[PDB]
């Protein structure tokens, strides 16, 4: 509490629209979460709300465990995690309704 950790999900291919990012993603995606943290379902006005919070908290928690371990997430990383963690939070909000 107040957060909960969801079960792990299979990684989607995600196409980012440019040759450089697709390659970048494929090479760095192992560094990103494959499961999400969230607050209970009865604490949000909607999906959009849940998802916003699930994405921020998760990247923050994920960013903290990686830094202790050294290394950093860059802006592309941060950009790509949001997209993919967003996808994941959405599947999770669905598993609840």
């Amino acid at each position, epitope marked *: 509490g107040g957060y909960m950790l969801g079960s792990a999900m299979s990684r989607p*291919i995600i*196409h*980012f*629209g*440019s*040759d*450089y*990012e*697709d390659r970048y993603y494929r090479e760095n995606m192992h560094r990103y979460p494959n499961q999400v943290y969230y607050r209970p379902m009865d604490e949000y006005s909607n999906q959009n709300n849940f998802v916003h919070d699930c994405v921020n908290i998760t990247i923050k928690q994920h960013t903290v465990t990686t830094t202790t371990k050294g290394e950093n997430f860059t802006e592309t990383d941060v950009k790509m995690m949001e*997209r993919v963690v*967003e*996808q994941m939070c959405i599947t999770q909000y669905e598993r609840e309704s």
Partner: antibody, heavy 119, light 108 residues
Framework: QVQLQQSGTELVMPGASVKMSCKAS????????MHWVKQRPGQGLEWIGS????????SHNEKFKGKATLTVDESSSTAYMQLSSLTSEDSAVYFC????????????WGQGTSVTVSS | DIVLTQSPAILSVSPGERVSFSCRAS??????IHWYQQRTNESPRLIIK???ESISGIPSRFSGSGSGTDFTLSINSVESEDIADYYC?????????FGGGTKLELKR
């Protein structure tokens, strides 16, 4: 056979918005990025923005960011681009196009919606 | 932004002749350049992808070569239906950019 269907023409008042449609068929809609390209009369191509129908993630030409809103309707295999606050600068043909799978040459092109801005 | 420069802006050619035009990028893009043909009052059409890969249903007389910053499209035997504008475009990084086009014309 892949098709991308665009309305031929739109007459829109200066200051008004227009929402142009691009309806895809003959393939799996969510598997390919769709792109929108502007061409002013007698001039070259200009990229506006692109969208991944799978999650509606978008990329824009910086100068269209705030001007062109890209969406899809997954239920109807349709991509839409809305232009708001039209001026004579917006009179042009707008093509939609579809790239390959994880590759970004524009493989299929719509016939273009010719937009005329006039009072 | 990667700026793509095409030259010449207009080229006059005689039928059956072999012709070429070039697309040069301000930064290295590997092979991430594509070529389109646009005849008067038509949509553009993909002619070569990724510098050199041929496209289904496009005549084998079209070819492209190059890698890095300097790219060339060549047409082995120009036919009247090839008279059109040709644009290059990159997809290596955002924003996508297009060359300004090379217009093909018939010598008379």
């Amino acid at each position: 056979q892949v098709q991308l269907q665009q309305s031929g023409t739109e007459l829109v008042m200066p200051g008004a918005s227009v929402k142009m449609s691009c309806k895809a068929s003959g393939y799996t809609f969510t598997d390919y990025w769709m792109h929108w390209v502007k061409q002013r009369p007698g001039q070259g191509l200009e990229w506006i923005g692109s969208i991944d129908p799978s999650d509606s993630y978008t990329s824009h030409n910086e100068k269209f960011k705030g001007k062109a809103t890209l969406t899809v309707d997954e239920s109807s295999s349709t991509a839409y681009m809305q232009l708001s606050s039209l001026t004579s600068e917006d009179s042009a043909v707008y093509f939609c196009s579809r790239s390959g799978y994880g590759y970004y040459a524009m493989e299929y092109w719509g016939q273009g919606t010719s937009v005329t801005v006039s009072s | 932004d990667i700026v793509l420069t095409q030259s010449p802006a207009i080229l006059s050619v005689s039928p059956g002749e072999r012709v070429s035009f070039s697309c040069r990028a301000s930064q290295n893009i590997g092979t991430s350049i594509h070529w389109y043909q646009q005849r008067t009052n038509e949509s553009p059409r993909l002619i070569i992808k990724y510098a050199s890969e041929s496209i289904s249903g496009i005549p084998s007389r079209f070819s492209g070569s190059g890698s890095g910053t300097d790219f060339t499209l060549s047409i082995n035997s120009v036919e009247s239906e090839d008279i059109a504008d040709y644009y290059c475009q990159q997809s290596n990084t955002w924003p996508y950019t297009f060359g300004g086009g090379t217009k093909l014309e018939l010598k008379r």
